[PDB]
Structure formats: C-alpha cells, structure tokens
Design a protein around this ligand. Structure first.
Ligand code: F3S
Ligand code: ZN
Ligand code: ZN
Lengths: 47, 49, 90, 261, 66
C-alpha cells in the first residue's frame, strides 16, 4: 500500500513502487517507515 | 466495593491495553533459500480464505 | 413492558412487570397503602441486574386486588396531572 | 396542594411542594434524570484522525458535549417511537480541522451543525489538542434518547428531594451561631434570630450543644425539590416532561392491565 | 491526558472552566476565590479541577506516525 517516512514523525509519503535494495526512505534515507490509515469511512459508536 | 455506574459511563477509570506482534524474514544462509511476506493463495499449511 | 400474573385470588394478587424499576414500583406501593380496604402492599426487585419488579397486594375482601391496583393508578395519574397544571403556572 | 418557588438561578430551580406524597416527589426526581429526552451524539463517522486521542476517546468526548435540544423535541421522533431508520430523526454535525505549524486547540465552536437550531450549549469546551501537521475530519449523528439508556442523555446534573425544616429558638444560646454549618442562625442585638430557616438540613448538631434553646422538627407534608440542569433544557420543561413520562407509563400499565381481566 | 468534559460524580460540565482557572491561579490568585466566583461550589467539581495534570501538551510531541 502506501507508507510514510518515520523521520520527524509525519515526514512524507511513499508507495510500493519505490523498489530499492533495502527498506529505506528514498528522500531522507531513513530505515523506518510506517503504514497509512487506508482512507475509508470508519464507524465508531460513541458509547 | 460498590462503584458508581454513571461516573464510569463518563469515563472515570477507563483504560486501553496494547499488545505487540513481531516477525522477521530470516535469510537462511545455510542453503540460500529465503523467507517472503506474501499472501498464501496456494500453500501447504493454509488456514482459510 | 410486559405484565404477568403469578397468583391471583379475590383478596390476593402477585403481578410481575418486566421493563420497570423503583420509579413506578415505589409510587404504586405508596398509592396502594392509601387505598381503603388494602391490608398489605409491597414491591420487590428480584435482582438489580434485571429490570423487572414484583408487586404483592393483599386486601381484606371488601375490594378486589385488581380494583385496588386500578384505584392506585388513578390516584397517581391525578397527582401527575395536578403537578403539571401547577408547574405550568410558575 | 400549592407549589411555591424559592430561587431561580440560570440553571437551578428550587420548589416547595405542600400536599404531595413523598413517593410522587421521588418519582418526579428520578424521572427528571431517567425519562427526559435530549440530543446527544450517537455515532461518529471517522475519515481522518492524527490527534493523540484515539477514535473511541474522541467519540466519547464528542458524545459528552451537551447540545441545545429545546426546539428539537417537537421535530424529531422520540426513542420510544421507531426513531433506527427512516431518516428525518438524525441530525448531522461535521468537524474538519488541521494544524499548520503550531499546536492548536479545537473547541466546541468548531462543530458545524446541519440543522441550525441544534448547537452546543457552550462554545468554549476544549475537545482535542493537535500537534504540528495533524488533522481531523469526522461526521457525527445526533438523536434523542433517555437517560435510562445512557447517562449522556440525562438533562440534569443534580436532582434533590429533602424534608421541610422547622427551627424554633427558645433561649438565647450563642453557641448555635458557630455550630450550624448552613448558617441558619445569626446574632442580632444578642437574641439569636433565625435568618434563613429553609437552609437547615436537619443536621441536628445544634441540639448537641444548645439542648433546650433550639428545637428542630420536620413538616410532615412539605418537601423541597431542587434541580440543576446542564443547559440543554430549561428546568420547567424537564419537570413537565418527567411528569408526562410518568403519565404515559401509568396509562400503558392501566390499559394493558384492565384489558384481559 | 486532557480535561474531562463533565464531572464524574455529577454531570456538570467542567471542561469549559479549565483555561480560566488554570490561568488566574498562575497569576497569583488563590484557588478558592477563583473556584467560588467561577461557579464551582460542590467539592466534586473542585476535586475535578484542582487535580488535573494535562499530559497531552507533552504527548503532542510523541504521536503515532500513522
Ligand atoms: S445547628 Fe445548623 S444546619 Fe441543621 S439541625 Fe441544627 S440547624
Ligand atoms: Zn523521508
Ligand atoms: Zn461535580
């Protein structure tokens, strides 16, 4: 899916298409990336 | 002890519990085969669709 | 809110009401204790986790227990109407 | 069986009931909490959330916010009716905020309501603090409900029924002025006059020291009923709706009791 | 983490009285007078206001990178 660079918390977004020899942010060269919230309406009951 | 239910419904002693799961792709240098993290369309130990 | 009858005689009634709690039970007991001819009136909550009450009425035979319950309901309705009409004036 | 008024503050209302039984007054007090409908958030539709608060916590905070459900009691279906489908009984509010470079606090004035006569009671309620480059986008649905189902539907904060006091001064003991926690007594020309008798809570502490100069009784047929609303409804409307709920329940019970005798 | 919307014991709204009380107390005013004149009289709401910690101002720095 889509990822987000871990440096400075919410840095920038990248996708599957960035094929690199290792897990690395193409922009800042950071080795930790996270996953996006999969934009979709989520229903939660205010109980 | 007896606790007030109305104060509980206002969020008095509510809490959240966090658990962690972890995995690694072992390289298996002994035979050069490697792991991979993909879905399991057709595999031996399949669980269910 | 559903009612059922556990026991019933001319001078005895045991009524189980599901969907009710102290708000109506205490009012009905207080009104029943004022109706003439009623010798014993009580309500019980069998379990706090269950919303249901049991009303026990025992008269002296002059008036049927069901009639006593109807009279108590009439008294409560009269009091409620009077309260509305008096609060609306202030 | 008259009803007298003691005080009318912004949200408080105190009355004296003179010929009502204690059971009826207590029933009115309980129904002012349990069986009066107000508007509150029922469900939240989340699109984005980056705030420190999770979705469930944010939904709970939104639900606890009181809305002005005064004109909505005549245009929206009550929970006792069908109310779960047939749109026309749900109000919709939106919240779309974002912080650019500095932390930003989100207040209840940022909630935009589809229907203009249903607004938050107060616009200065802090909801969530957002850090840099954090945003929230959600839609919430409002509906009527009773306090019996959930406490977020209760229209009052305190509902009180207490006895009617009667304090009489027999002697001239000076201790009573410095013992009563309610400040009922006062010293005027060294006589121990009673200023505000209705403030006594039948504490019976002046009897421990005076014991002969002060007599305390409770009037057998008068009661004091004090309620304080939260802002959604005015107290008189709350009392009227509580008594109407009692009327409906009694009518239903009698109707289904006399039938099938 | 953040001030509760309502008092736990009674359903009185107390969240809107935090940013005044938190400021005027830091200005040298004694808490009792500020609480009394803000409209807080039952000691449950006084307990709610007097013992808040407000951690969220530190947690906004450490937020989930989702
Ligand atoms: S001293 Fe004071 S508050 Fe009540 S019963 Fe006796 S009056
Ligand atoms: Zn990066
Ligand atoms: Zn309180």
């Amino acid at each position: 899916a889509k990822y987000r660079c871990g440096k400075c918390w919410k840095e920038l977004d990248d996708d599957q298409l960035k094929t690199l020899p290792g897990v690395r942010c193409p922009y800042c060269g950071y080795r930790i990336i996270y996953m996006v919230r999969k934009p979709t309406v989520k229903i939660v009951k205010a109980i | 002890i007896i606790m007030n239910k109305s104060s509980i419904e206002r969020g008095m002693y509510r809490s959240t519990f966090f658990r962690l799961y972890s995995t690694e792709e072992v390289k298996y240098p002994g035979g050069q085969e490697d792991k991979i993290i993909t879905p399991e369309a057709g595999v031996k130990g399949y669980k269910g669709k | 809110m559903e009612i059922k009858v556990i026991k019933e005689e001319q001078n005895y009634l045991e009524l189980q009401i599901d969907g009710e709690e102290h708000t109506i039970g205490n009012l009905l007991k207080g009104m029943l204790l004022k109706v003439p001819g009623v010798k014993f009136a009580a309500y019980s909550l069998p379990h706090p986790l269950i919303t249901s009450i049991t009303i026990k009425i025992l008269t002296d035979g002059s008036i049927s227990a069901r009639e006593a319950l109807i009279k108590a309901i009439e008294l409560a309705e009269n009091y409620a109407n009077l309260f509305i009409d008096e609060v609306k004036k202030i | 069986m008259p009803i007298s008024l003691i005080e009318r503050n912004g949200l408080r209302l105190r009355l004296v009931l003179e010929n009502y039984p204690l059971e009826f007054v207590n029933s009115i007090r309980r129904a002012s909490i349990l069986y009066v409908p107000v508007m509150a958030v029922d469900e939240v539709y989340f699109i984005e959330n980056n705030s420190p608060l999770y979705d469930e916590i944010l939904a709970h905070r939104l639900a606890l916010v009181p809305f002005v459900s005064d004109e909505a009691l005549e245009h929206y279906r009550p929970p006792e009716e069908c109310a779960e489908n047939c749109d026309g009984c749900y109000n919709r509010v939106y919240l779309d905020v974002e912080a650019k470079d500095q932390p930003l606090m989100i207040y209840s004035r940022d909630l935009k309501s589809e229907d203009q006569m249903i607004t938050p009671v107060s616009g200065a309620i802090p909801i969530v603090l957002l850090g840099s480059k954090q945003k929230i986008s959600l839609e919430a649905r409002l509906r009527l409900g009773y306090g019996k189902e959930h406490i977020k539907y209760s229209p009052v904060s305190v509902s009180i029924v207490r006895y009617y006091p009667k304090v009489t001064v027999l002697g001239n003991c000076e201790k009573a002025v410095e013992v009563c926690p309610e400040g009922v007594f006062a010293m005027e020309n060294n006589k121990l006059v009673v200023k505000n008798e209705l403030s006594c809570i039948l504490c019976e502490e002046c009897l421990k020291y005076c014991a002969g100069s002060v007599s305390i009784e409770s009037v057998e047929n008068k009661f004091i009923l004090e309620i304080e609303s939260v802002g959604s409804l005015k107290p008189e409307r709350i009392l009227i709706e509580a008594s109407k709920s009692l009327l409906r329940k009694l009518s239903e019970l009698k109707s289904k009791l006399e039938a099938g005798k | 983490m953040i001030i509760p919307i309502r008092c736990f014991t009674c359903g009185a709204v107390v969240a809107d009285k935090w940013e005044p009380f938190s400021n005027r107390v830091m200005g040298g005013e004694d808490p009792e007078k500020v609480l009394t004149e803000l409209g807080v009289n039952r000691y449950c709401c006084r307990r709610m206001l007097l013992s808040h910690v407000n951690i969220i101002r530190e947690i906004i720095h450490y937020t989930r990178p989702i």
